[PDB]
């Protein structure tokens with residue numbers, strides 16, 4: 001680490017955790033609790049460095065109770081060790097889904113604005129067919145497949161092969177998620193996307209996709225929190 | 228496929244490849260060469276379906292020499308098998324470069340948008356240091372490395388791990404490319420002016436001006452790569 | 465040499481090696497073994513002159529088997545040729561370790577004296593970071609590397625390039641040693657307490673207290689190495 | 702580089718060079734002059750980073766005149782490029798000799814305090830013989846050899862072989878220097894060293910050696926400056 005970064009981190013930890021000195025005999029417990037709470041409510045974000053001497057100084061204690069607080073946080077999967085970083089706050093259970101959906105919004109918005117201008121009658125008919133099959137489908141495994149196919153039909157004229165490979169990969173991952181989880185967790189948005197693609201209303205279609213994916217990530221994260 | 232698409236592909240293949248029936252003993256060699264020639268000169272574009280029976284029919288041969296031909300093409304990386312499509316014509320290196328840079332513009336612009344508002348004094352100090360090393364660097368190997376570290380410095384606060392893996396993959400690929408090709412590109416003396424502009428705009432947290440500058444920088448990159456690859460194809464290197 | 469030194473060496477060699485005259489066909493093997501045994505058990509100390517005629521005389525043989533013997537010893541690194549001295553008994557690994565650590569105490573203490581008053585906030589931040597990485601490190605390879613970087617951090621403002629080359633040579637040698645041997649040393653769980661103390665004293669610019677702590681740290685190092693090497697010699701590893 | 706280090710360097714460059722903005726047309730010349738003078742008189746020590754943008758900001762100019770000032774400094778050998786550092790102030794011609802003698806003082810002081818306690822009559826006689834031969838020697842190549850031999854005779858009982866190898870190496874380097882340079886550039890100090898070693902006055906002997914080597918480095922650096 002670097003001096004300015006280190007001092008900025010120390011100021012940040014103080015603003016989030018405070019600087020009250022616990023009794024020596026309460027230090028192990030009090031520090032674990034304050035760290036856990038700050039981690040769980042997001043005020044100490046993932047990737048924040050958890051340095052024994054920085055925390056011992058902040059709280060006016062020896063390193064040992066900090067070290068033993070950090071050990072329990074790791075047992076609880078709230079901290080992990082990374083190479084060149086030491087102990088850092090671990091990602092919350094929703095983080096990867098947030099990242100995944102953010103990336104899909106970036107990639108698919110681009111696939112959609114390349115494809116819409118070029119979609120032909122055959123593309124638009126295949127898309128209509130997939131939504132129509134979605135309307136009457138009851139099998140949860142078939143729902144994930146058809147939703148995938150629908151979204152892929154809108155990207156049928158995306159003319160960047162590297163982009164498309166990443167797009168498919170995200171859609172495959174989503175299908176796998178829905179096949180295994182949708183049981184345990186509405187075509188109007190799909191029709192709207194189709195209507196806007198038919199009209200070649202490119203950015204309105206993209207905006208509609210972003211809204212659709214942002215509802216998706218909210219449903220996924222809510223479900224992961226549920227467990 | 229359906230009757231219309233099939234039929235259109237068959238007429239198209241005839242227009243590009245003709246329909247002389249080679250003798251049996253020459254069918255594989257004749258067909259491998261016609262398809263390779265047509266792929267390389269762009270007349271059979273990437274994504275074209277290469278179907279054994281369609282091609283056997285066109286050339287008046289059996290599937291066997293067509294299948295052998297297409298295996299040689301796959302071994303040369305001029306065709307790839309894709310699920311639901313079969314054997315299709317693969318993108319050539321120039322098309323792949325064009326798609327690669329378009330994707331880096333897409334990915335790196337978002338990285339910049341996310342990172343710029345959060346960059347700390349150490350990030351900015353690191354970036355300046357790398358440009359300063361670029362200013363006095365003479366080894367070509369080191370130029371690729373220092374260039375990559377500069378761009379990574381500006382993305383240092385991109386807190387999407389999935390996005391950053393793709394951004395880094397792209398930067399590593401560039402570095403590897405420059406590592407081997409830069410001394411053959413003949414670009415002359417290089418200037419740090421663009422890097423300094425990128426850093427200045429990053430420092431001021433001028434986010435869209437910075438994105439615009441990166442888009443210029445990357446579009447000059449793909450133009451340079453593209454020109455080089457055509458030189459290399461022509462044998463003018 | 466002169467008559468007295470020669471004569472004393474000759475009596476000494478007899479006291480250590482005896483004087484049985486081996487048969488000709490066994491002279492080389494007998495002599496190589498007696499000298500090697502006596503070198504390894506310390507009874508012929510490092511720096512002892514090994515002179516062909518003196519040894520031929522003692523054993524009642526010709527110079528040839530003595531010369532062959534001494535060549536085998538040189539090939540085993542148990543003797544070295546030095547200018548003005550000839551073939552002398554080489555230091556064994558334990559003596560060499562003892563001399564190496566004494567020299568690091570000498571060199572590193574001066575490095576610390578020169579560097580401590582000048583260390584900047586980035587130097588101190590780097591040092592803390594390395595100890596913090598040592599605290600949570602489980603790979604033995606990485607422990608040697610992180611240990612070396614910590615010590616180098618404290619010497620970061622030693623502005624004598626000749627001294628620093630020797631200091632770095634010593635630290636690289638330690639790292640290389642730990643890289644291969646640490647997992648076999650059985651030292652148990654290791655503590656960062658000494659490193660933190662060194663940094664604390666460096667931060668306060670308590671120069672002689674810091675030197676004293678480093679001297680303790682290095683003397684525990686040579687004791688550990690020495691014990692390990694004897695284990696290794698005994699075959700108790 | 703790191704943020705705090707960079708800002709400390711910027712403050713340092715300002716205290717040494719000032720911050721007066723030259724006319725655009727004088728920038729190239731004025732900056733070269735101020736840098737050269739600060740380098741030659743030691744106020745910008747060797748290893749100081751010379752960063753085009755830092756200097757352009759300091760002087761309120763564009764990078765080009767700084768870049769062209771730095772290029773002339775390099776032509777004059779006052780700056781050199783180092784890996785991971787960029788352009789740095791180069792060592793002055795006396796720097797390596799200062800380093801060499803500093804290191805000899807460290808190593809030889811230790812050889813001397815290991816050896817003096819153990820020196821015997823034969824050692825002390827060999828040492829006396831070398832000084833006596835130095836007193837009557839007129840050949841400059843023989844003077845360097847005998848001075849070496851004298852100093853080695855005092856280290857005859859140094860019982861660290863690694864140390865001794867470094868010591869010999871420094872003495873060899875000195876002998877080579879004196880063989881080639883002494884022409885173009887006094888046994889009382891030698892006798893004093895011998896007298897103190899005879900008495901086993903260990904630290905006084907070491908102090909006397911340090912004084913001897915510090916006069917040596919002063920003569921060597923003075924001569925290098927002369928050219």
Ligand code: NI
Pocket residue numbers: 147151190212
């Ligand atoms: Ni959907």
Ligand code: NI
Pocket residue numbers: 374422444
């Ligand atoms: Ni660049």
Ligand code: NI
Pocket residue numbers: 611659681
């Ligand atoms: Ni250590």
Ligand code: NI
Pocket residue numbers: 848852891913
């Ligand atoms: Ni002298």
